[PDB]
């Protein structure tokens, strides 16, 4: 029974780890998506100039 009680929380931490890797990956995509737009704006200034 204690084995099943431990297996429940280790599966729950598997769920937490998958969710955390999804959030890290998605934050890390959004930061690049914002970096590209800042670069596009400061490049558009040079093209207009």
């Amino acid at each position: 029974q204690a084995l099943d009680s431990a297996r429940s929380l280790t599966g729950q931490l598997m769920q937490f780890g998958s969710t955390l890797l999804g959030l890290i990956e998605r934050r890390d995509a959004e930061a690049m998506s914002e970096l590209l737009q800042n670069q596009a704006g400061e490049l558009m200034l040079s093209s207009l100039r």
Binding site: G41, L45, L48, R49
Partner: protein
Amino acid sequence: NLSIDGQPLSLPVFAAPADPAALLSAAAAASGGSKPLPSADIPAMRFP
């Protein structure tokens, strides 16, 4: 200060044009308070 054809002997009055203004928009972090905990009451089921 003209010539005999009426053409100006001076160089014309130059004017360097203005640089294009960089656009800038308002950016604000979202603001929001946490939600307080609901009230408590003892249930009918035991803790396990």
